């Protein structure tokens with residue numbers, strides 16, 4: 001009989017990998033290890049060992065080391081071929097002040113802790129909170145933001161970490177709209193350090209704002225030519241040979257020209273359906289990606305439990321509440337206050353009026369059938385949330401602190417969603433969006449002005465709503 005087993009593994013510099021036969025007996029008539037490629041490193045004594053330690057050296061570049069074990073018994077020959085590649089350590093750096101990028105990043109971190117258990121992670125998130133215990137579970141060190149952006153504390157921590165290593169790969173994960181505020185402060189001081197490589201950049205939309213910006217930019221003359229022309233502008237700024245930075249889209253959608261970059265779009269098809277963005281679609285090419293909504297469900301049960309704990313969402317309870325009554329489920333999305341100089345109570349009352357219209361079968365804006373009522377208040381709603389919830393005795397509360405985007409991520413969207421406009425509507429399937437209410441703002445003071453706004457024009461183009469779904473409350 002002959003058995004041949006093969007495997008490969010990355011070994012981080014200075015870490016240990018145990019070479020051992022794969023699925024073989026513990027004892028042999030004869031046996032040997034030999035090294036078949038890579039700089040000689042096998043010790044003479046280990047040739048007759050069954051298992052022994054490979055300690056990864058510190059190198060100027062990655063290198064593969066190949067080892068073959070041969071073991072013979074009376075009726076069976078066992079061969080194990082193991083290829084070890086010595087790699088630089090990887091530091092993963094996460095920066096976000098919103099919700100959606102942080103939530104996507106958290107899923108990635110949970111996966112990556114299992115796939116890359118040696119990697120250190122530095123995390124600066126404004127909305128998602130990782131406590132000390134969960135942080136240790138995920139090899140996370142948390143750092144504050146400076147306002148909304150990368151802190152000097154984080155920059156110095158990365159500098160120190162880099163200094164401590166023979167070589168370093170850095171992976172960045174951040175918010176697409178604010179990439180230029182977050183990455184250059186880290187990239188610039190490391191730029192001339194040849195042992196440090198920015199190995200990957202992952203950029204995530206945070207919501208509607210990236211689409212409004214694209215909408216406002218789509219008719220700009222010669223816009224891709226201008227983008228191309230600003231690549232060197234970004235490059236020289238990062239290299240610290242010029243103080244001039246690209247303005248606008250040039251500091252946002254040129255990263256893939258300089259680094260291995262993925263742009264995760266919440267609605268990648270916007271680049272398809274909006275004809276004046278076909279040129280940007282082509283310019284980004286394979287770097288443009290669709291943000292996935294189903295990765296949570298592919299996590300293991302224990303991993304799902306960890307995600308839920310960190311984001312503060314009792315999914316099991318909401319599942320139970322959805323099933324309390326056999327009616328389909330409606331979530332009203334609340335807001336805070338808006339323009340007009342009215343009292344807090346006025347803003348709560350207007351939202352109560354909206355719900356009353358929604359559940360009134362004689363109203364033109366009736367949801368269309370009977371639903372069980374659920375309330376997702378704005379996190380900053382305060383007493384407004386209490387007033388609204390208290391106005392509907394059988395309405396079930398979904399804790400306002402939870403980012404609404406957690407529901408779409410965990411496949412916990414209800415049958416229908418309606419209420420005050422928010423970025424959260426950009427990640428709800430059209431079939432689940434009932435109506436959206438726009439309130440008085442500096443740019444919107446009636447329904448006609450709402451319909452003509454960039455935000456609504458984008459949602460119409462994307463099919464999130466039709467005009468009949470767009471409502472106004474002063």
Ligand SMILES: CC(=O)N[C@@H]1[C@@H](O)[C@@H](F)[C@@](OP(=O)(O)OC[C@H]2O[C@@H](n3ccc(N)nc3=O)[C@H](O)[C@@H]2O)(C(=O)O)O[C@H]1[C@H](O)[C@H](O)CO
Pocket residue numbers: 099207332333334335336376377378379400402403404405420421422423424438439
């Ligand atoms: C153009 C403009 O002024 N945009 C602002 C925006 O800069 C920000 F100020 C905010 O952002 P807004 O997208 O409403 O909400 C931000 C985040 O809050 C959470 N959320 C909100 C409501 C809710 N019922 N459950 C939730 O969970 C979601 O995570 C969401 O992504 C805000 O008040 O924080 O309000 C909007 C608009 O003034 C508002 O949308 C008009 O209705």
Ligand SMILES: [Ca+2]
Pocket residue numbers: 321322323324325326327328329372
């Ligand atoms: Ca129900």
